[PDB]
Amino acid sequence: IIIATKNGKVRGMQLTVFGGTVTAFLGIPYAQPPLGRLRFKKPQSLTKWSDIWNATKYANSCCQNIDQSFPGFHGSEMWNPNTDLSEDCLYLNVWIPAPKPKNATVLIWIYGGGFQTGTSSLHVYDGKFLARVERVIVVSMNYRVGALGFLALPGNPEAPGNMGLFDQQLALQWVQKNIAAFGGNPKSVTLFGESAGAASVSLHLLSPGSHSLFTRAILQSGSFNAPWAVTSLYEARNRTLNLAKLTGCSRENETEIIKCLRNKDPQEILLNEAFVVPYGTPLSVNFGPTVDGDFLTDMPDILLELGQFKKTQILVGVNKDEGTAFLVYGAPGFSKDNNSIITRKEFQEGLKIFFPGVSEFGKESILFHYTDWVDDQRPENYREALGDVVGDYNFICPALEFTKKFSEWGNNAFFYYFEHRSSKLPWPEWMGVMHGYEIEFVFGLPLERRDQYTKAEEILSRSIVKRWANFAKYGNPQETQNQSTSWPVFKSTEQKYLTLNTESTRIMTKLRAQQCRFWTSFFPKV
Numbered sequence: 001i002i003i004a005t006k007n008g009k010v011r012g013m014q015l016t017v018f019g020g021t022v023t024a025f026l027g028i029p030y031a032q033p034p035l036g037r038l039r040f041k042k043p044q045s046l047t048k049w050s051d052i053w054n055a056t057k058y059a060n061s062c063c064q065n066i067d068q069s070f071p072g073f074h075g076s077e078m079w080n081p082n083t084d085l086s087e088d089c090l091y092l093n094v095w096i097p098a099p100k101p102k103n104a105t106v107l108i109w110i111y112g113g114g115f116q117t118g119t120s121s122l123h124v125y126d127g128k129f130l131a132r133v134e135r136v137i138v139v140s141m142n143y144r145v146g147a148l149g150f151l152a153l154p155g156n157p158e159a160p161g162n163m164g165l166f167d168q169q170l171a172l173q174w175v176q177k178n179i180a181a182f183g184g185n186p187k188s189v190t191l192f193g194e195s196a197g198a199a200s201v202s203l204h205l206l207s208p209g210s211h212s213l214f215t216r217a218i219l220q221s222g223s224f225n226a227p228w229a230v231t232s233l234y235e236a237r238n239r240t241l242n243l244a245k246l247t248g249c250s251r252e253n254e255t256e257i258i259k260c261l262r263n264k265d266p267q268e269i270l271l272n273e274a275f276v277v278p279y280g281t282p283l284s285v286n287f288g289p290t291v292d293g294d295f296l297t298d299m300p301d302i303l304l305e306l307g308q309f310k311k312t313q314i315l316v317g318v319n320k321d322e323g324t325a326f327l328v329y330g331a332p333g334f335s336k337d338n339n340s341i342i343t344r345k346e347f348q349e350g351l352k353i354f355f356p357g358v359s360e361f362g363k364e365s366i367l368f369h370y371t372d373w374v375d376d377q378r379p380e381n382y383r384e385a386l387g388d389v390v391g392d393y394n395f396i397c398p399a400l401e402f403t404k405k406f407s408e409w410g411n412n413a414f415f416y417y418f419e420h421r422s423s424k425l426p427w428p429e430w431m432g433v434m435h436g437y438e439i440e441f442v443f444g445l446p447l448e449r450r451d452q453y454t455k456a457e458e459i460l461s462r463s464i465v466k467r468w469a470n471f472a473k474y475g476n477p478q479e480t481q482n483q484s485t486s487w488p489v490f491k492s493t494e495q496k497y498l499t500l501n502t503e504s505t506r507i508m509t510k511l512r513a514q515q516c517r518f519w520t521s522f523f524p525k526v
Ligand SMILES: *[C@@H]1O[C@H](CO[C@@H]2O[C@@H](C)[C@@H](O)[C@@H](O)[C@@H]2O)[C@@H](O[C@@H]2O[C@H](CO)[C@@H](O)[C@H](O)[C@H]2NC(C)=O)[C@H](O)[C@H]1NC(C)=O
Pocket: 238, 241, 242, 243, 245, 246, 275, 276, 277, 278
């Protein structure tokens, strides 16, 4: 199957999925490769090609540091890139139903990874199941990460910041201009993403240049108001300047810094990214989104508070144990290979690691709020408190605040709490329902009966897949056929949310009420 796009013909490949067929176009270029003088710049448009472009394998992933903390361990290596790293990485993928659809709704996936890592070719982002089962079109793109995607000297077009977000935006433009040739409906495009991908989706809701490029949005475990998601212009300058010092590129002409950085091998830039922060946390967002005056016209908290965003429906949610994954990347006493019973002293040191530069009083206030136990003899008390501290502060309370503020301007919002721990999860049981492990259910991997998931997980994934697809198609994440719990709208008053689990799907209210009042209303003052 060959499709004529605006810039040339592309050839795809046929996939067998569940006794049917999906057509995949893997690795279509959507921008000029950002090499040489184009490194650190906004992505430039593609010029035509005259032959057929073979989109039959995933393209290069963008340059990035790799998680080496657990060599040989699937729980960490499943997130590492599975194609060659290259600056030549601005490519996207398209899965379409067979036979070709007539006007299919389009799902555009934006991966996470702290804005420092990630790739669209991971196994858990394979869009072929969604295309097969729901007859939607799935698109995913690679976008630049790390310093190469987010180095910033604001106002300087040699390195303006937010290049990785402009990569994503150019891919959204490509879908608007080209997806009807694949049978897609450019007027029915839903963005979905997880972690930094979800933060990205929320920033497209704020960016005037993305407003005409999509219809609706799904935010899995992230939002821009999360404390890790936006770099201040002061942090960003200190970090750009530190990178230049570390690479021998310090100059008084800021533009000459950039030209010096453009002569370094990518690996020299990657090696020094970790050190631009003096005292950072486990997996620090060294180079992330900034208020650049282009993609982001103002501090996003102000835009959110004053209703300056695309008015549409949103689907937002979080996992039960968002914080646990990060504990084994630096908190003392923690290990994926034992049950990580920690002491009060270790909990206090863990707060030092996750809240550097917070006052002694601020850290005491966290301890005060999280250590007033039901039973103080329970050995797991501090282990579980530290995970909840990290998950509530970094993910759950910001997602809930985002949903409240967004819905106050009149739109329908739906909030979920994912509490199922995958039967195959390679991480230990104390880590629970971790960050990132709803993704395989959203993409329908448990629908493949070969792949060792349980029957209950197939049913759960099937329901989630239908709810997500109904949200994208119709703005309403219901499963209408199988006597399912109806998913109520989230309103700032009642704050109803839907729990997702294999047993009983339930309507609850005011998730983490006490904890989020601490994080949202008190802790920003310290
Ligand atoms: C802003 O940057 C300075 C410089 O950071 C140092 O040099 C970089 C190239 C990199 O290698 C960093 O890891 C270095 O720390 C920071 O100043 C340092 O601050 C720490 C403690 O705050 C101190 O021990 C170092 O001696 C300082 N070094 C210098 C040269 O002043 C500074 O903390 C950074 N952050 C802020 C908010 O200013």
